[PDB]
Design an enzyme around this catalytic site. Structure first.
Site, mmCIF file in Angstrom:
data_model
loop_
_atom_site.group_PDB
_atom_site.id
_atom_site.type_symbol
_atom_site.label_atom_id
_atom_site.label_comp_id
_atom_site.label_asym_id
_atom_site.label_seq_id
_atom_site.Cartn_x
_atom_site.Cartn_y
_atom_site.Cartn_z
ATOM 1 N N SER A 179 7.590 24.415 -17.479
ATOM 2 C CA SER A 179 6.329 25.124 -17.370
ATOM 3 C C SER A 179 6.498 26.547 -17.890
ATOM 4 O O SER A 179 7.566 27.152 -17.782
ATOM 5 C CB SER A 179 5.893 25.142 -15.901
ATOM 6 N N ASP B 22 6.581 5.628 -8.749
ATOM 7 C CA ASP B 22 7.472 6.790 -8.638
ATOM 8 C C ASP B 22 7.982 7.188 -10.017
ATOM 9 O O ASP B 22 8.969 6.607 -10.439
ATOM 10 C CB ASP B 22 8.619 6.443 -7.704
HETATM 11 C C1 RQD Z 1 12.273 13.121 -3.682
HETATM 12 O O1 RQD Z 1 11.991 11.756 -4.067
HETATM 13 C C2 RQD Z 1 10.951 11.204 -3.486
HETATM 14 O O2 RQD Z 1 10.570 11.463 -2.383
HETATM 15 C C3 RQD Z 1 10.272 10.177 -4.365
HETATM 16 N N1 RQD Z 1 10.497 10.484 -5.794
HETATM 17 C C4 RQD Z 1 10.894 8.865 -3.890
HETATM 18 C C5 RQD Z 1 10.306 8.323 -2.610
HETATM 19 C C6 RQD Z 1 9.101 7.646 -2.629
HETATM 20 C C7 RQD Z 1 8.579 7.081 -1.483
HETATM 21 C C8 RQD Z 1 9.311 7.161 -0.340
HETATM 22 F F1 RQD Z 1 8.875 6.499 0.740
HETATM 23 C C9 RQD Z 1 10.506 7.826 -0.265
HETATM 24 C C10 RQD Z 1 10.983 8.430 -1.405
#
Ligand code: RQD
Ligand code: RQD
Length: 330
Positions: free
Chosen positions: A199, A35
């Site tokens: 962007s 992430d």
């Molecule tokens: C908006 O944030 C996100 O969805 C990702 N950056 C974090 C996120 C990643 C996996 C998940 F199961 C839930 C949330």
């Protein structure tokens, strides 16, 4: 040092990507969701409330000879969809694709929200945003990348996500065989703790490029591309029968449609997202209404270049003293 690991879509829609991560001694391999929009490395564990575990692989610190409880440390995180998790903290050895960090904070979940329980393919997250967003208290902890950086050949990692196919996360080097043309680098703001950039504009299909600044974040954890309502309306206006559905929660379109491409600007360069990348399939099994991969950010507070955008590019996360982002076509 360097590392290189394959990342694999969790399902047929590329909802998310999982990358194997070795934790502890002997290694316990968990499949984590890398992430770049968060800064906690957290895992399902032997401490997770039993009713909240449904098929995930768990980390058991008591079986790792290198695990150490980080005394007094707790963590608690909430994400953009409203999901959440929390727990306590160990330090342990963590390896990704052959790159090893000792003393990495491994955040062990005691509680996870239902969306985590219901996804059996994700064993936790590995945050790659800036360590200022890490939630561990009372002593904030560093990300895997921050801990590895000084040892890496170059202080970078790259994301090369596949469309309906595996891709690669590399640490410490830029694979010059993995992209076409040149990499265009662009400035990053680290003030909010994310890979935030601007962007230079967009085009819809074969239409003319609109030069306009769009500030947003490069978020490998987000499935979709979230952009200002004006941009999103201009895109979906080119798809007959597409409309924003309040009941479904975004733009939907007839599954019989052929979608146009979407281009975004990186400096003077252009990244083209093929139309097929914007199709997220039926809203429910058997429906002829399909969910769009470009959605409005109006209710978020920031624009998000999620997987839909990033998978069209080879993306360099340059963690030099002044960070930058690089994008190449591929
Ligand atoms: C908006 O944030 C996100 O969805 C990702 N950056 C974090 C996120 C990643 C996996 C998940 F199961 C839930 C949330
Ligand atoms: C938003 O949650 C997540 O990012 C993870 N559960 C991965 C995931 C994302 C979307 C989806 F349709 C299914 C799974």
């Amino acid at each position: 040092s360097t590392g290189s690991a394959t990342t694999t879509p969790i399902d047929s829609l590329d909802d998310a990507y999982i990358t194997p991560v070795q934790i502890g001694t002997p290694a316990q391999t968990l499949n984590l969701d890398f992430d770049t929009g968060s800064s906690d490395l957290w895992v399902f564990s032997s401490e997770t409330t039993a009713s909240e575990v449904d098929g995930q692989t768990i980390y058991t610190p008591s079986k790792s000879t290198t695990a150490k409880l980080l005394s007094g440390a707790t963590w608690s995180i909430s994400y953009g969809d409203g999901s959440s998790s929390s727990g306590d903290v160990y330090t342990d050895t963590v390896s990704v694709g052959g790159l090893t960090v000792t003393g990495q904070a491994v955040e062990s979940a005691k509680k996870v929200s239902s969306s985590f329980t219901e996804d059996s393919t994700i064993d936790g997250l590995l945050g790659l945003a800036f360590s200022t967003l890490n939630t561990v208290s009372p002593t904030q902890q560093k990300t895997f990348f921050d801990n590895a950086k000084a040892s890496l050949d170059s202080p970078v990692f790259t994301a090369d996500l596949g469309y309906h196919a595996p891709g690669t996360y590399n640490f410490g080097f830029i694979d010059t065989t993995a992209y076409t043309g040149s990499i265009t680098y662009t400035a990053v703001s680290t003030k909010q703790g994310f890979w935030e950039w601007t962007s230079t504009g967009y085009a819809v299909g074969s239409g003319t490029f609109k030069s306009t600044s769009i500030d947003g974040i490069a978020d490998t954890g987000t499935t979709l591309l979230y952009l200002p309502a004006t941009v999103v309306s201009a895109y979906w206006a080119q798809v007959s029968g597409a409309k924003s559905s309040s009941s479904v929660g975004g733009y939907v379109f007839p599954c019989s449609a052929t979608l146009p491409s979407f281009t975004f600007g990186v400096g003077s360069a252009r990244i083209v997202i093929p139309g097929d990348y914007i199709d997220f399939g039926p809203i429910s099994t058997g429906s002829s209404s399909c969910f769009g991969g470009i959605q409005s950010s109006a209710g978020i507070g920031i624009n998000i270049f999620g997987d839909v955008a990033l998978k069209a590019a080879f993306v360099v996360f340059n963690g030099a003293t002044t960070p930058t982002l690089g994008f190449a076509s591929k």
